[PDB]
Amino acid sequence: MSKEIPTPYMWSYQPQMGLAAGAAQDYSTRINYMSAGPHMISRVNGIRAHRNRILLE
Amino acid sequence: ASQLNAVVDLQDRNTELSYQLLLDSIGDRTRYFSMWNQAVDSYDPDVRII
Amino acid sequence: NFASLAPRHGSRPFMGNWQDIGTSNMSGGAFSWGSLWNSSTGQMLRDKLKEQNFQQKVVD
Structure with missing residues (x-):
């Protein structure tokens, strides 16, 4: 929400091709x-x- | 005073089953306690298996 | 001193805890290891045999 303490975004993996799929805010x-x-x-x-x-660094 | 609730309940939780399992875990289950109607359901193991 | 006349579990005399020395009375006194027309000749024998051992807290 807040533009200063934002919920982080977590990547989604595609195993098959090896590239990284789209990501999203963590929702779980x-x-x-x-x-x-x-x-x-x-x-x-x-x-x-x-x-x-911790994450940024 | 604080006009805000302090118990949050979702539709996912199943507190009935959780309480059942807790009662099973902490103490013996087959005993009967009439205060909470604490009687566990069961079958005759001869009726279920002939 | 008196460790000689004790069962030995191997270079280590097996002297028990001393905490234990006698109180029972009528309230507040309890001890562990507590208690616990013929129609169908099925699980009747199983239940008769079931009164032969409790594993509740078997200790060794």
Whole structure:
């Protein structure tokens, strides 16, 4: 969502040709915090930021 | 005060079956407990297999 | 000192835990290893034989 902490995009492999097929945002591992307050919501956003830092690097 | 829910239920989960399996796992099952109507269903193993 | 008169599991006298020395009474006292017209001559013998061993917590 946020243009600064974005859910990452995960590639899809085509085994047969060896090229990489289209990718997409990850949609199986999202965290549902829609029932949380600002504390945990900030904590989760920080966690996703940490994950993004790990990936980029 | 917090006018927001705190129990999130999806259509995928099957809490009935999960509770059944948990009851089977943690303790004995064949025993009968009338408080929760805790009676497990079964057949006579002679009726099922002649 | 007294390890000589003990069964030995091999260069290591088999002296048990000392924690164990006697309390039972009537409430709060329980011990492990708990308890547990002829129509069809099928599983009747199986159930009669079923009263011969519990593997519940067999320990060795």
